[PDB]
Structures are given as structure tokens and as C-alpha cells.
């Protein structure tokens, strides 16, 4: 009966492909060919955050668009004041092999994980002054590649053991475990309503999970290599995935397929980070080629380049008000662009 | 600022601590420990004193060795092997008395992040290798091995097979044979690391 099940899976995949191709009546380019291009987008390094001494692997903005947490393999997580360049917190980590960091939307907590397979939640607003490890969420058997706070109490984490987990920080237990990826889940972005999230794994697929039910609603397989970054469109009805194939692609949740691909002939380095603008018109993608390219998300043409990093840019983030974009890089420098 | 002066003072205070901690961390020699499963990694890491990554740190002749055993990461290296691109050396352990190791060594010595990093190669279980040679010929593993079936020549052939998987001239492979009934592994690591330190210092000055 194994062969029958395999044939049923193959025919179901064929049916999904036929349904997705039936809805592609007109591509995104043939629709947005009539809009004026944004032209050149000249962004200048307004601030440079010179605090880290090793490669920066993660960064995250505060919901107030002023605080930024950064994670470097120096063993530190520094909370930055982007307006004044000041350092408000320097959090020493038990394990220096940190590959992700998150900032709670309330601003009271900071998450951090990496090669220790543990997501550590840090209390920024401790009554006793310093920052203390409120919780160490140890349930993953592989490296934690991403983590995002749903609220002060629950966090969704992505791990290199092909699983995504939803936690309850008060009890430290996996409320839900999302399974179905066949490769290391490398990226994760939560929707604006945080009722569902997408994860990009190394099997060149991105799955649309919903946190409440714990089931993979949709699967988007368009890439050719490992997906390194993922980010929702501001409306929450689309997302962009940047892979090691040196291309980042736009997917539609409702249309269930890709809308545009952002690739250039003179680009061969893979994507490391992808972020959208406040209105979603610009797609800022970080590259291993030491540069960040601004893409016109609708015209699929480069509107600018955020050059000025001496090594691969590992992270990128646009503030909630869209005022600025922060890029961290392997040269231990985080630069605010505007 | 009004009372942002105090915030700036705090920022400077913790920046000074960041600089001090970086200075303190720069003194430690970081070694990445690799090899196949049950290849003698645990034997050498449990004989020189002290669940994702296991860090074993020790001091030998005024050198702090930060040794990372990353064998517990049941995933693909390419997604986290760049975290270790700043290690001084790669300690590779091979079990003689047991092709997978050759493929792993070829992948890790020809990695884009480890072009200049040098590998300190360990060939453990020398005595068990000799006993197995006395019991079974070494031609079983290597079909293209032609030569005497003595311990010395077979062991040298294995070492040459391993040393022939590298191509970058700017790195050396230090091969040592251990019977696991010995405590000279720390000295072997120390002397190889001193050679690597002088080489990297010479490259940093443009003199080499």
C-alpha cells in the first residue's frame, strides 16, 4: 500500500500545481507595468553602532522604532538607542554561539538562541536593576535559527531540527510543535495579527503555519536552494523569501504561489536577510556580497544599493514606523540607513 | 542633554566593559574539534581535563584552549560551520581501527571558510589498528592499496591519504598517531597551535 500512498501524494501535488497554475491569469509585472518607478533610492548611513567585537548574526527593532537589540558571537546582546547611538543594555550570554535574537513588542523581554539549542528569555525590566534570564526554553534538538515574540508570554521559535515550536514562557513548555519541514528551518516571520506565521527551511520550501491550530495551512516551493530569510508583506497577505540561490521571491498567501522574483545577472551571493518597507513598496534584501539591495517590490527592479559593509550583512530590519532600516554585518558593525 | 548625560555615561561604562571582555576573550585559543562518530573525540576531550555544542576549556603552558565539540549537532554543517571560521585550528580525530572520515576531512579542509585554517589531525586507536592488521588486511578498506601489510606502512598510507585531501598552500595538516593510552595529546596540540600562531602572526604582518 506504500506505492499507492506515494502515487496519491504525487497526484495530489499535481492537483495542487494545476490549481495554482489555473489562478495565474496575469502576473504581477503585467499588472504593475503602469505605475511610476520609485527611481533611485539614496539611503545614507545616519548612525553606526560600534559596540560588537565579533560577527553580528541577528538584530531586531523595538516596537517604539528606537530600541534595537543585536546579537554577536562575542557572547553579548546589546540593546541600542538608535537615535543617540547610546547603549542601554549589554547582556552577557551563557553560550556565545548565538544566531538569533528577538525584541518583545512590549519591550520588556529579549529572546536569544543559537547553537546551544536553547532559547533564552531575558527580563529587561527586572526590579533588581540588571537584566536576568527569566526563562531558558530547552526543547529543541537542533540549533535555534529564529525566534519571534507573539506577546510577553508566548514565543515561536525555529530550529535546525526541522521543527518550529510555540512556547509558553511562564511554564517553559512547547504549547505547540509545528512539524513538516524536511530540512533545517532557517527563517521565521510572524504575521501582523500574529494569528499565523511563515517559516523558510533548507528544503527550499516555505510553509504557512498558524499558531492557534498548529497545522501547515499552505506550502510554497519555488526556490532552488536553502531559504535564509522570510518576511511578511505589511498587509499580511503576502511574503518575501530570500534564498541562497541569490534570488528573493514574492509569494501570495491567497493566490498560493509566487508573484515576482528579484534576481539580477550580476548577483550570485545568496540572500541573508529580507525586509519590507512600511508601505511594502520596497523590498530590502541583505546579501553575502557585502551589500544590501533595495528592490521595487512591484516593479521587481533595483531602486538602490545599501553598500558600506565590509563583510556579509547578516541581518536587516525596518522600523515599525518605516523611518529607518538597520543592517548588521559580519564586520561587527550595525549601521542605520535613512 | 538633561539626564541623557547620565545615559551617555552609562553607555560609556558598558562600552568599556565590552572592550575589556573582548580583550580578555582574544587571549583564548579556539579549536574546533571534528571527526566521525566514536572516532576518539571523546577520548581526547576526556583525557585533557574537563547539548548542542560542548565547550571544553583548559590551560596548557600559559595558553587557554577553548575546544568546541560540535558533534551533537545532527544537522548540516553549512548552516552553522561559518560560526567557527575564526578558530585557530581544526582538531580532526580519525579512528584507525574502524571513507566517511575521508569525505568529512575533504569537505572540511576544502571549505570556503577554512581555506587558511590548519587542521591538527589525530589518528587514534593505533594499537587496535595494529591488532586488526594482525587479524585483517588493510586492503579491505582501500582497494587501490598496494604494499606491505605491516602496521607502519599501512598507517603511513592512511596518513598520506588524509594529507592528500587539502589543496591550499597556506595551511598545514599536523598528523599525530595516538594509542589512547597516552597523555601527550595536549603537547601535540600545543606545539601545532604554536606553529599556527606564529604563521598567522607572520601573515598578519605581511611577512609570510
Amino acid at each position: 500500500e506504500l506505492d499507492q500512498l506515494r502515487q496519491e501524494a504525487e497526484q495530489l501535488k499535481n492537483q495542487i500545481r494545476d490549481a495554482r497554475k489555473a489562478c495565474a491569469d496575469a502576473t504581477l509585472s503585467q499588472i504593475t507595468n503602469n505605475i511610476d518607478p520609485v527611481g533611485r533610492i539614496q539611503m545614507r548611513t545616519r548612525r553606526t553602532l560600534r559596540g560588537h567585537l565579533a560577527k553580528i548574526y541577528a538584530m531586531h527593532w523595538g516596537t517604539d522604532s528606537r530600541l534595537l537589540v543585536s546579537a554577536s558571537q562575542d557572547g553579548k546582546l546589546i540593546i541600542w538607542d538608535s537615535y543617540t547611538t547610546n547603549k542601554v543594555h549589554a547582556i552577557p550570554l551563557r553560550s556565545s554561539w548565538v544566531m538569533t535574537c528577538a525584541y518583545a513588542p512590549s519591550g520588556n523581554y529579549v529572546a536569544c538562541g543559537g547553537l546551544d539549542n536553547i532559547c533564552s528569555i531575558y527580563n529587561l525590566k527586572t526590579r533588581e536593576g540588571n537584566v536576568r534570564v527569566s526563562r531558558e526554553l530547552a526543547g529543541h534538538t537542533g540549533y535555534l535559527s529564529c525566534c519571534r515574540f507573539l506577546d510577553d508570554n508566548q514565543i515561536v521559535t525555529s530550529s535546525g531540527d526541522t521543527t518550529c515550536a510555540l512556547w509558553d514562557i511562564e511554564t517553559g513548555q512547547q504549547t505547540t510543535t509545528f512539524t513538516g519541514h524536511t530540512g533545517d528551518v532557517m527563517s521565521l516571520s510572524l504575521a501582523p495579527d500574529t494569528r499565523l506565521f511563515v517559516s523558510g527551511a533548507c528544503d527550499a520550501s516555505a510553509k504557512l503555519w498558524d499558531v492557534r491550530e498548529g497545522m501547515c495551512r499552505q506550502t510554497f516551493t519555488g526556490h532552488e536552494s536553502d531559504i535564509n530569510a522570510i518576511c511578511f508583506f505589511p498587509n499580511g497577505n503576502a511574503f518575501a523569501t530570500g534564498s541562497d540561490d541569490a534570488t528573493c521571491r514574492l509569494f501570495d498567501l491567497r493566490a498560493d504561489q509566487e508573484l515576482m522574483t528579484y534576481s539580477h545577472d550580476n548577483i550570485i551571493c545568496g540572500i541573508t536577510s529580507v525586509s519590507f518597507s512600511k508601505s511594502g513598496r520596497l523590498l530590502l534584501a541583505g546579501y553575502d556580497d557585502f551589500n544590501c539591495n533595495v528592490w521595487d517590490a512591484l516593479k521587481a527592479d533595483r531602486a538602490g544599493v545599501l553598500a558600506g559593509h565590509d563583510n556579509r550583512v547578516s541581518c536587516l530590519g525596518v522600523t515599525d514606523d518605516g523611518m529607518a532600516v538597520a543592517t548588521g554585518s559580519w564586520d561587527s558593525f550595525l549601521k542605520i540607513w535613512n | 542633554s538633561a539626564e541623557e548625560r547620565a545615559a551617555l555615561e552609562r553607555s560609556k561604562a558598558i562600552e568599556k566593559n565590552l572592550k575589556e571582555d573582548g580583550i580578555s576573550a582574544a587571549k583564548d585559543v579556539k579549536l574546533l574539534l571534528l571527526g566521525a562518530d566514536n572516532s576518539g573525540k571523546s577520548t581526547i576531550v576526556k583525557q585533557m581535563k574537563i547539548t548542542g555544542i560542548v565547550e571544553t576549556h583548559f590551560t596548557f603552558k600559559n595558553l587557554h584552549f577553548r575546544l568546541f565539540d560540535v558533534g551533537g549537532q545532527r544537522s548540516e554543517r553549512k548552516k552553522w560551520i561559518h560560526c567557527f571560521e575564526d578558530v585557530t585550528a581544526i582538531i580532526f580525530c580519525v579512528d584507525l581501527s574502524d571513507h566517511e572520515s575521508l569525505m568529512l576531512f575533504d569537505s572540511i579542509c576544502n571549505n570556503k571558510f577554512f581555506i587558511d585554517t590548519s587542521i591538527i589531525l589525530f589518528l587514534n586507536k593505533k594499537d587496535l589498528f595494529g591488532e586488526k592488521i594482525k587479524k585483517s588486511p588493510l586492503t579491505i578498506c582501500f582497494p587501490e592499496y598496494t604494499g606491505p601489510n605491516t602496521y607502519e606502512d599501512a598507517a603511513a598510507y592512511i596518513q598520506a591519504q588524509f594529507e592528500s585531501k587539502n589543496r591550499s598552500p597556506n595551511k598545514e595538516i599536523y598528523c599525530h598517531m595516538t594509542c589512547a593510552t597516552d597523555t601527550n595529546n595536549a603537547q601535540v596540540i600545543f606545539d601545532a597551535v604554536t606553529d599556527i600562531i606564529i604563521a598567522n602572526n607572520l601573515r598578519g604582518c605581511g611577512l609570510y
Epitope: 547610546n86 533588581e128 536593576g129 540588571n130 | 538633561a2 547620565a6 545615559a7 555615561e9 561604562a13
Partner: single-chain antibody, 231 residues
Framework: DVQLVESGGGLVQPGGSRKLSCSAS????????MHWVRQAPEKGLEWVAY????????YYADTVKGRFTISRKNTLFLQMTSLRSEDTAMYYC??????????????WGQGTTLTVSGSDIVMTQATSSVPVTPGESVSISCRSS???????????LYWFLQRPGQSPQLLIY???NLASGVPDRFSGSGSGTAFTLTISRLEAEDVGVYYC?????????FGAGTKLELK
């Protein structure tokens, strides 16, 4: 628990000297700025001295400079010299960590009664006593000679509540932010120079004297203190 216990207060002959310790426990003392705030038996609060984290910057009041010395075993010191007759007061120990979004002056010490035998920002609370009943809304007011709003947008007005027989508790910091643990019934508002602290659904635990303090520049200046009494 966070605790600031001070000792070293008692009868001192005029012209003498006395040192006051401030033993801290339950918090990271090294990273906090420390203040000495004195209160005369019949008057309101009066900022005395401040020593920053790491002993970087030390500030003294106009009538304290030269005579006193603040230094910081998790303890802070106030080495007084040439104690006049006006130096008799209760001396409080205050922790005032400073970063972006921090809440300075959020914890005050118990206090020690020490009975001894020009261009500053003047902040005036015009009303000194208000009659009020539980369940009603009482609004306290305060003014400042200089605008407390800075170019960064923060207005540095602080509201403290000293309940009868207790140490002051921070209610509102930077003129609009409700401190930690303070009930939501307290609200702060103002515009540049004139500020208003609004209390809704007044309870019996909110009876006391309220101070307005500016943190725009040193010396920090306290208001006279609007005393709210029950019935």
C-alpha cells in the same frame, strides 16, 4: 527584595561632623545612581547630593557643596562637615538608574532623623492643602520657572507621594509616565511650565503630601508639597 536601609542619624553638636551609611540589598547597587534627599521636620524635600554609577559625576546642592561628600559592599556614604542648625532633617537614600526609558527615583530608603542642636529652577505648588473625600477626583498642580521640556521631547517633572509616616514613593516620572506598582488611577499632565497630577477615584491609601521635582538640571528642585488630607 529591594531594600535601602540607612543609619547614622542622631543628636550632633553644631559645627561637628557625621557620616551616614546607606546599606543596599536586593538590587544591583553598582549600576544605579544614588541620591541623598533630606526633609526638614516642618518643610518639604530638598535634594542634597548625587553620585553616579561608577562614581563618575557627583553633584551637591548650593547649601551642601564643600561641607558634604557623597561616596559609594553595596553601601553609599554622606560625609558631612560643619553641620549648621539648618542641616537637621531626615535623610533619604534614593536609587536613580539612568538609561533610555528608565524610571529614576523609583525606590527610596527608610530615612534617618539627624537632629542637630540663584539660577536654579524654582518650582512652586501654589496650593499647600486640599480638603477631599474618598471616591472624588483631586487634581494637584505645580509650576516651574523654566520650561522643563527638552529638545528631545521629554519633560522632566517627577511626582512623589509621601504618605504620613512613610518614605516618598515615585508616582509619575517625566510628567506623564506612571511608575511601577502605582495604580492606574494616578495621571500626570502638563505643558512646558505648568503641570497637573490628576487622581481619580481617590482612596484612603492616597492621602499624603505630593511633591513635584524637576530633573532637567542639577540641583534638582522639589516643590513645597501639596498636602491632601482626608475629609
Amino acid at each position: 527584595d529591594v531594600q535601602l536601609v540607612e543609619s547614622g542619624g542622631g543628636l550632633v553638636q553644631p559645627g561637628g561632623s557625621r557620616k551616614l551609611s546607606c546599606s543596599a540589598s536586593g538590587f544591583a547597587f553598582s549600576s544605579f545612581g544614588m541620591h541623598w534627599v533630606r526633609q526638614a521636620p516642618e518643610k518639604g524635600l530638598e535634594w542634597v547630593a548625587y553620585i553616579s554609577s561608577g562614581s563618575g559625576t557627583i553633584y551637591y546642592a548650593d547649601t551642601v557643596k564643600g561641607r558634604f561628600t557623597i561616596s559609594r559592599k553595596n553601601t553609599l556614604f554622606l560625609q558631612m562637615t560643619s553641620l549648621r542648625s539648618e542641616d537637621t532633617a531626615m535623610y533619604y537614600c534614593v536609587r536613580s538608574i539612568y538609561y533610555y526609558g528608565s524610571s529614576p527615583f523609583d525606590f527610596w530608603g527608610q530615612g534617618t532623623t539627624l537632629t542637630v542642636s540663584g539660577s536654579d529652577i524654582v518650582m512652586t505648588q501654589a496650593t499647600s492643602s486640599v480638603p477631599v473625600t474618598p471616591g472624588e477626583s483631586v487634581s494637584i498642580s505645580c509650576r516651574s520657572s523654566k520650561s522643563l521640556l527638552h529638545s528631545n521631547g521629554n519633560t522632566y517633572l517627577y511626582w512623589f507621594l509621601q504618605r504620613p509616616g512613610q518614605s516618598p514613593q515615585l508616582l509619575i516620572y517625566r510628567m506623564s509616565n506612571l511608575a511601577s506598582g502605582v495604580p492606574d488611577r494616578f495621571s500626570g499632565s502638563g505643558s512646558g511650565t505648568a503641570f497637573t497630577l490628576t487622581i481619580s477615584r481617590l482612596e484612603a491609601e492616597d492621602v499624603g503630601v505630593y511633591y513635584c521635582m524637576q530633573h532637567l538640571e542639577y540641583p534638582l528642585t522639589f516643590g513645597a508639597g501639596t498636602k491632601l488630607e482626608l475629609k
